[PDB]
């Protein structure tokens, strides 16, 4: 669930991920997808994407289980929808932490509405 | 849909609801509620008892027919659910108004982990 992604997020970046994350180019926060503005939005695009592509489970809403083993999130989840959800928020946390580096703070509160669509995951 | 939500707190408020109110408290935003920090909190917290009320239809992605008229927001829409989404919408959009001049910015982007959990609606 979002619970989880946030605790991730916190754990990869140490940003507060609401503020860094929770509104952020065309692809982080609500709204859904489109064109990413930059390889940070690009996470989130991924990110979206991956839990597009979720069959069995509900990502948003369905907590699961993981492990912070030598400063690595570990997703020990046997349910495998809960795992590849895991593995979806997981990836976007160090997608996050990666792209600290090119992070631009203009692209916070990006006006989603106006992004270009994006192209289908 | 957050659309239409987003709107109407900017209406009412004057604020951007995204970076005033998309992580506020324990309640306004992502991850469901929690005991409320303040007045602030408080409509979030029963904007959210308020969606669980609903009867189907999906306060997130949903779209409304709403008017701002006479500085009034108008929930026009007929369709049962939609219309007491809308309702519920204009309520927080209300009162995030009504309680402004408490608004603490110490709350945005308030780490939800930290929050006692919420009482049931
Ligand atoms: C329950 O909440 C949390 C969980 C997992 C991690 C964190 C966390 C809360 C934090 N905060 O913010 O209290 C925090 C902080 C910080 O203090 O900034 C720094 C970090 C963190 C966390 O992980 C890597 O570096």
Redesign the pocket.
């Given at each position: 669930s979002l619970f989880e992604l946030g605790?991730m997020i916190?754990?990869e970046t140490?940003k507060?991920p609401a503020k860094s994350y929770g509104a952020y180019g065309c692809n982080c926060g609500v709204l859904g997808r489109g064109k990413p503005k930059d390889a940070t939005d690009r996470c989130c695009y991924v990110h979206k994407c991956c839990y597009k592509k979720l069959t069995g489970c509900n990502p948003k809403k369905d907590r699961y289980s993981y492990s912070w083993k030598d400063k690595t999130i570990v997703c020990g989840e046997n349910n495998p929808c809960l795992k590849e959800l895991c593995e979806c928020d997981k990836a976007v946390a160090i997608c996050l932490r990666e792209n600290l580096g090119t992070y631009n703070k203009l692209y916070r509160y990006h006006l989603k509405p106006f992004c270009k669509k994006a192209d289908d995951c």
């Open positions: 605790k916190l754990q140490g507060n």
